[PDB]
Design a protein around this ligand. Structure first.
Ligand SMILES: [Cl-]
Ligand SMILES: [Cl-]
Ligand SMILES: [Cl-]
Ligand SMILES: [Cl-]
Ligand SMILES: [Cl-]
Ligand SMILES: [Cl-]
Ligand SMILES: [N+]
Ligand SMILES: [N+]
Ligand SMILES: [N+]
Ligand SMILES: [N+]
Ligand SMILES: [N+]
Ligand SMILES: [N+]
Lengths: 402, 402, 402
């Protein structure tokens, strides 16, 4: 009976929902207290907007029967099915759409206008996430007998749980947004001057990191597509990817004597988790440890590099979700068991199609949003006024009276 | 084997327990910091008191073989059974008793004496919740072969997971309490003057709302009574009810330019969830969206209305749990598939018995507590002294030294 | 098929992971804000260090085929198995190693150097936890056909989920640490003078207590070793142990009019849970209530006693985890159904072997760490400098610039 798998997917979707709690804590604690309420408002609003969009038409665009191969075109206002796994799958996939979009808020914090962020959320949920999703995962409908692969999927692109599909998409859109709104006031000065701006509730960011970690077990577990005796290995690999991402960054912080090491260590854990998201089902425990640990290190160096580039990513979305997601997606070709690849593929062939997916994601999730958000910003400024930035977005639109 | 259903109910009970974490966060962040520790003490104490009461005799009163039909009279000090689903069921039902009662603390915050609140908790757990529970749900014992319906249940009253039984009961008792202790100092002035009093950790209230949301999946899932292929639809409906409650309130807040929109949006999500609690198993996804969205709107207008009535409900218990619970309970007759009704019932017949349950709940959970708490208050003042209100209940009985 | 049990163990391991979130909240809220970030850094770092150690060799030492009976010697870098339950089991057991060690941070807070704590964590994870674990639980490998019992296990020592193995081990090592680093500045004065030092985010400690509670269901549930119709009784007993621990302390606090009752009540809940950890599978609901309630009372009196001894245990690790763990381990002989004992054992025989395990744990987890940590402290001071204590460990190594 379809019962055990349905129950499994539903519990995994519950775990994905706790990731939304995780992000709210992670982001809100990493900002100053004068912004922390606006952060909270962004994090509940995006969830509601994304869920409404995904239910109304995003699931249709992503998973419906492919019209030309670019997009799906049935499953609007999702309700009834003759596929007894589909409804569980739909709920789980709705939680992934919410995850991809909510990544963006942490990069743009402390100076993006609320309504501006919600419009970006609409673009993510309505167009960018479901269309890329179709291309990578369009054929991958749980319990379906009549599915057709998206075009990247058809070429052999592998992404077990969304290193590219969820995390890179969000990260590319975040990068676009921070380039357009610009750095916080007081972040960068002179030519090479960098000031750190620290959050006011870093303990809540640690809670948040643990909630994200917990949720990631559902994120990866619910993507497995079945139950067999190798499911527990996905969970070990998830644990090792996160813990080695953190451990490696802890070692680096001890070695470098890093200021506010906590932020780097937590980001290391998250980067480790993102990197194994592509391959949790296809690698050994040693390679999970390796891929996660490397991901952690990369997040550390990428944080430092973004600062040198005068790009202000408040919680390090790009180091964690984008650099981690790219690394994980390419790492799959280096480390995964080749039996998970198309029969006619070497590791070089697999590397090339993983790379094509990475580049395609970048062109569509960075290039198109960059152009569209730059256009929106010209007629509807996305950056708050200086007064609102200085007083804090708690005092912004829909907040407190100053 | 009874194994899968038992495991399911136990995991669902775990999820209900995280709702207690949710309430603690939701309430404590919505008060001023000088009250937030007292809030925490209320939220752990009520859980322990309710659990002890329910185990000792509340489960007997609620689910035991009906003595005259008003009350059960076996299952005291719950221990052993020959029903292999009963023990899981008992634990799940204990978590519901704790949920109904803990709703009350959020309405009465910042000026109800701790011991006064614990006495109200005893009244909820010992008398009001289990007796109403018997009348609505007395026959509904998981895996039982020999159960007899309560009298409302027998008449056709439907409440899938406790829009009335849990949420309205708590809300009615909360209303009684706020009318008796009166408004906070500084809340209302002149004839029409209203001051907002904002909480000091609104990010924690967003965390809390997500924890409540997560828990609600267990709340509804554990009430399903079995496993079949339509269980996943309960989870979709739960997701849509919450997300549409929030989305609708977000739209209203954008339209009205509302002050401290975050509080209304979070309350919209919770109201949406409460409304679908009555009918999650019997409605379509579109109707879940509709019922939840309407519930959200109602919570917004009900908040404003309570202020006009000079009734001080700190976290908006009555807008969320009582107005949401009533709306959901009546909505069941409008929207649910008629195959879930007694064979001899039109939608009008179903509307009338839903209404009878609503009114019966009000008379017993508002009318009786109003009379008993007004009596208690005469000999044991439930409102703190002005000094304790001003300094904060952190400095009250069992708190800090001033 | 092994499927349902594997899925069960994996969900239980997820619940154990939320206990790590619980500890982070419980500890960080119970310290002053100038220490709360260091607390968070300790709580994520220890998790990563323990996981790496347990994966690399701790699981080998604890559960590998016994070399002389003191220690295991295979399962290094855990990867592949022919036991289809082993991988799930390994992940669950990794979470237990992390739990035992992370207990220590709460006792030593506000004046132990970060690197000093991480070294103690290495000692816990690398030597103390896995070797004691072997002696108590070495034969208890899920789904194994060829296991040999550890020497205490062989003598009849019973510990269902780790009242001794997890909680007493951590508590003994915590005691050693607080004796060596000494009391916080301003805690004790004159000869009998005691100042309370209160945490700055006690609401977060209530959240933490609920997260711990929730996790404990997985902690006990995942230790059951199978699925049968008595599993739900483990969950009832867990609920009752916690709720009676809290309720009993609430009564005592009301009776004594105790200052900052919240801290005692939360600790009562945790102590109740620790005590039932030894016996959740082998006692009635009444005895769970009794054992938990007594555990709560003991935690209250033990807190007061430690102060009289001028021992500074910040969050009351020793009252909760050590006194609770000892009480629970001995209580098993008094209350458990004798069918769970070796056939040739009276309750007196069972009491004696429970006591031998308690004493053995103390000699090895207190005596050896006391000697080794006193030695480490001579060449690498574990107590922060007075300046760092006064300014707060947020400004310590790896923290903020002062
Ligand atoms: Cl912000
Ligand atoms: Cl704004
Ligand atoms: Cl209060
Ligand atoms: Cl009080
Ligand atoms: Cl500390
Ligand atoms: Cl330090
Ligand atoms: N979010
Ligand atoms: N977010
Ligand atoms: N509560
Ligand atoms: N509550
Ligand atoms: N930890
Ligand atoms: N800890």
């Amino acid at each position: 009976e379809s019962f055990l798998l349905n129950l499994w997917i539903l519990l995994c979707a519950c775990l994905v929902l706790i990731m939304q709690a995780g992000f709210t804590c992670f982001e809100s604690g990493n900002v100053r207290n004068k912004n922390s309420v606006n952060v909270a408002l962004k994090n509940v609003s995006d969830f509601c907007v994304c869920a409404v969009c995904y239910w109304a038409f995003g699931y249709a665009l992503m998973y419906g029967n492919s019209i030309d191969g670019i997009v799906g075109a049935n499953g609007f206002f999702y309700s009834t099915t003759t596929n007894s796994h589909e409804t569980s799958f739909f709920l789980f996939q709705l939680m992934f759409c919410c995850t991809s979009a909510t990544i963006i808020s942490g990069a743009v914090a402390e100076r993006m206008r609320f309504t501006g962020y919600i419009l970006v959320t609409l673009l993510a949920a309505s167009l960018i996430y479901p269309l890329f999703g179709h291309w990578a995962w369009g054929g991958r409908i749980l319990g379906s007998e009549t599915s057709t692969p998206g075009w990247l999927e058809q070429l052999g692109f592998i992404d077990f749980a969304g290193a590219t599909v969820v995390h890179s998409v969000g990260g590319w859109m975040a990068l676009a947004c921070v380039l357009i709104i610009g750095p916080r006031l007081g972040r960068f000065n002179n030519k090479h001057g960098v000031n750190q701006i620290f959050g006011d509730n870093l303990p809540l960011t640690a809670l948040g990191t643990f909630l994200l970690f917990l949720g990631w077990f559902g994120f990866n577990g619910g993507s497995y597509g079945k139950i067999d005796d190798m499911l527990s290995s996905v969970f070990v690999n998830t644990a090792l990817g996160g813990t080695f991402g953190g451990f490696v960054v802890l070692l680096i912080c001890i070695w470098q004597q890093s200021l506010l090491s906590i932020r780097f260590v937590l980001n290391g854990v998250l980067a480790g988790l993102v990197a194994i998201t592509a391959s949790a089902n296809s690698i050994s425990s040693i390679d999970a440890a390796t891929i996660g640990g490397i991901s952690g290190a990369l997040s550390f160096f990428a944080t430092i590099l973004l600062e040198k580039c005068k790009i202000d990513d408040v919680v390090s979305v790009v180091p964690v979700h984008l650099i981690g997601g790219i690394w994980g997606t390419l790492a799959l070709a280096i480390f995964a068991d080749g039996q998970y690849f198309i029969a006619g593929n070497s590791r070089v062939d697999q590397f090339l199609i993983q790379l094509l997916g990475v580049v395609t994601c970048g062109i569509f999730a960075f290039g198109l949003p960059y152009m569209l958000i730059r256009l929106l910003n010209r007629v509807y400024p996305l950056r708050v006024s200086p007064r609102v930035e200085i007083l804090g977005l708690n005092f912004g639109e829909f907040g407190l009276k100053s």
